[PDB]
Amino acid sequence: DYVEQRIDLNQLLIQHPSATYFVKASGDSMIDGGISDGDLLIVDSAITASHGDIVIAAVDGEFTVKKLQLRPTVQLIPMNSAYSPITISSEDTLDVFGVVIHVVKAMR
Amino acid sequence: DYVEQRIDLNQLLIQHPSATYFVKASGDSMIDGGISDGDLLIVDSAITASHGDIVIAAVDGEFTVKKLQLRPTVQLIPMNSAYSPITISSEDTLDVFGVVIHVVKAMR
Amino acid sequence: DYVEQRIDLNQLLIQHPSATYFVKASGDSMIDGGISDGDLLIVDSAITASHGDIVIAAVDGEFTVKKLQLRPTVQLIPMNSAYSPITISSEDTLDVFGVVIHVVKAMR
Amino acid sequence: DYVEQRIDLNQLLIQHPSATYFVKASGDSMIDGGISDGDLLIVDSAITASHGDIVIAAVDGEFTVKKLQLRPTVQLIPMNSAYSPITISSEDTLDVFGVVIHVVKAMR
Numbered sequence: 001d002y003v004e005q006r007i008d009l010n011q012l013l014i015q016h017p018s019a020t021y022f023v024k025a026s027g028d029s030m031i032d033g034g035i036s037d038g039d040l041l042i043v044d045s046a047i048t049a050s051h052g053d054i055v056i057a058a059v060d061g062e063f064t065v066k067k068l069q070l071r072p073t074v075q076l077i078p079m080n081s082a083y084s085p086i087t088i089s090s091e092d093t094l095d096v097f098g099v100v101i102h103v104v105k106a107m108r
Numbered sequence: 109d110y111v112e113q114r115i116d117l118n119q120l121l122i123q124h125p126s127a128t129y130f131v132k133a134s135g136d137s138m139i140d141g142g143i144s145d146g147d148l149l150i151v152d153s154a155i156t157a158s159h160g161d162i163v164i165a166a167v168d169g170e171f172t173v174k175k176l177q178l179r180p181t182v183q184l185i186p187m188n189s190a191y192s193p194i195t196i197s198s199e200d201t202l203d204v205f206g207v208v209i210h211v212v213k214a215m216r
Numbered sequence: 217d218y219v220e221q222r223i224d225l226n227q228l229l230i231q232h233p234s235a236t237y238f239v240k241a242s243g244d245s246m247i248d249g250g251i252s253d254g255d256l257l258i259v260d261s262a263i264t265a266s267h268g269d270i271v272i273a274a275v276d277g278e279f280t281v282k283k284l285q286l287r288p289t290v291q292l293i294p295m296n297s298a299y300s301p302i303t304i305s306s307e308d309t310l311d312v313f314g315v316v317i318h319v320v321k322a323m324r
Numbered sequence: 325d326y327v328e329q330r331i332d333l334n335q336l337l338i339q340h341p342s343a344t345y346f347v348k349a350s351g352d353s354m355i356d357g358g359i360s361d362g363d364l365l366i367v368d369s370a371i372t373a374s375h376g377d378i379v380i381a382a383v384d385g386e387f388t389v390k391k392l393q394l395r396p397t398v399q400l401i402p403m404n405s406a407y408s409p410i411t412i413s414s415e416d417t418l419d420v421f422g423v424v425i426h427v428v429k430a431m432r
Contacts, residue, residue, distance in 0.1 A: 002265040002284070002312050007128050009117035011402055012148075012309075013212065019117055021419050024385030034142075034213050040385060042117075054215055061348030061364060063387055097421075103213040104121065105142050106163060110373040110394060110420060120417075129311055132277030148277060169240030169256060169281055203237050205313075 013102055019046035021098070023056055025065055030054070033067065033079035039105050042064060045098035058095040060087055065100065121210055124154035129206070131164055133173055138162070141175065141187035147213050149173060153206035166203040167194055173208065229318055235262035237314070239272055241281055248271070249283065249295035255321050257281060261314035274311040275302055281316065337426055340370035345422070347380055349389055354378070357391065357403035364428050365389060369422035382419040383410055389424065 014020045025039045033054060035041065041056070049055050051070040056063065059076060066076035066086070074088040088094045122128045141162060143149065151163070157163050159178040162170065167184060174184035174194065182202065184194040196202040203213045230236045240257045249270060251257065259271070265271050267286040272279065275292060282292035282302070290304040304310045338344045349363045357364065357378060365380070373379050377420040380387065383400060390400035390410065398418065400410040412418040 002286070005309060006125055007118070007122065007130060007309070009121060009150075012130070013117060014115070017114060021116060022120075022385050022417070023382065023387075034144075034215075040120075058345070058347065061346050063347075081258070093346075100171075100215050102215060105211045107142075107154065107208055107210060108388070110392065112420070113272065113418060115417065129274070130277050130309075131279075166237070166239065169238050171239075201238070 016046035029078040029080050029083045031080050039103050041100040042102040043098035044101050047099050049096045049099050054100045056097045061098050127154035128152050137186040137188050137191045138189050147211050149208045150210040151206040152209050155207050157204045160207040164205045232262035236260050245294040245296050245299045247296050257316040259314035260317050260320040263315050264314045265312045265315050272313045344368050345372035352406045353402040353404050355404050363427050365424045366426040368425050369423040371423050373420045380421045418424040
């Protein structure tokens with residue numbers, strides 16, 4: 001007879017469970033990226049950030065969810081035409097805490 | 109000492125696990141709604157559809173993910189200015205298979 | 217005198233009316249099975265799928281009408297020599313929505 | 325003759341340099357604790373949080389600097405009579421990112 005394999009979102013969405021956590025998006029600096037105020041960002045800290053990845057980082061002691069740009073220069077760029085990029089020069093401190101792998105949007 | 113309580117997406121996102129399943133969105137008839145081609149739609153079939161809910165439905169034997177409109181007339185309307193609404197008259201058969209509660213977008 | 221008992225297709229073809237629905241076949245992956253593009257598949261969801269039954273299922277969020285194979289391994293196999301079987305391994309999710317009990321072919 | 329051994333703040337203040345970072349304090353929910361808006365909090369993530377420790381934590385996806393209370397119940401309590409405690413029940417998710425070991429106040 002057939003057996004219904006019940007849905008398991010951790011197996012489907014999470015690769016490294018012991019290093020995965022969720023951060024709630026704030027503001028609309030990343031709306032064009034699909035990230036809106038209130039959404040859940042599933043963050044994996046066991047994977048190393050690359051050019052293009054959206055990361056949870058701390059610039060000069062302040063956290064933000066931005067798109068990592070390593071070339072031509074290290075920068076944290078938004079995905080909203082109204083916001084401006086953040087350059088990471090030598091007097092600044094960049095700290096990446098994980099790569100956002102999924103965005104969970106609620107509908108009701 | 110303190111002990112970390114690991115993330116559990118099922119507890120966080122699913123209410124009726126025995127009647128919840130995921131459908132993969134197709135095309136872009138629902139982009140303004142936040143649903144894009146490829147996204148996972150978490151569907152709950154244990155809740156009854158209401159006006160405004162985004163549902164997985166079959167109209168005349170063909171499946172679709174659309175927004176249910178019961179007033180002023182029963183219709184399945186997209187969320188893309190380029191697509192047109194579907195009226196459900198008496199010669200047509202509507203069949204709702206569940207309400208989309210969350211959209212999981214991947215960021216790689 | 218004789219009384220003509222008018223034809224009633226629901227009584228003749230449908231066993232569980234409250235759980236029976238119709239899906240329109242797509243493509244020709246099941247032509248050898250007698251299912252062709254456009255035909256109506258009368259689906260009963262109140263009956264549990266067995267080896268050999270033709271089912272409406274969702275594999276990784278995508279719907280299909282295929283023949284259920286449980287032995288020697290779970291597989292969704294077509295009925296067209298040109299199409300290839302689908303194995304349902306542990307990283308995959310199978311979801312059966314009902315057993316096709318009849319096929320309605322139109323003639324004009 | 326005598327040779328002066330220059331000051332080194334890392335040797336003096338940091339124990340695990342590979343897991344130490346600085347977070348800039350926000351608001352005044354922790355003023356009685358000596359932490360004021362703008363101060364640098366030197367955070368060590370290589371040490372496990374205990375009752376009484378001031379930690380950098382994320383409750384339901386939102387970051388905060390609070391005092392960890394494990395007894396009688398797990399709570400995140402401020403150090404400002406005007407703010408109220410945060411209980412961490414089962415429907416809530418606590419995530420500790422490190423213990424604050426020092427507060428650097430600037431005098432200009």
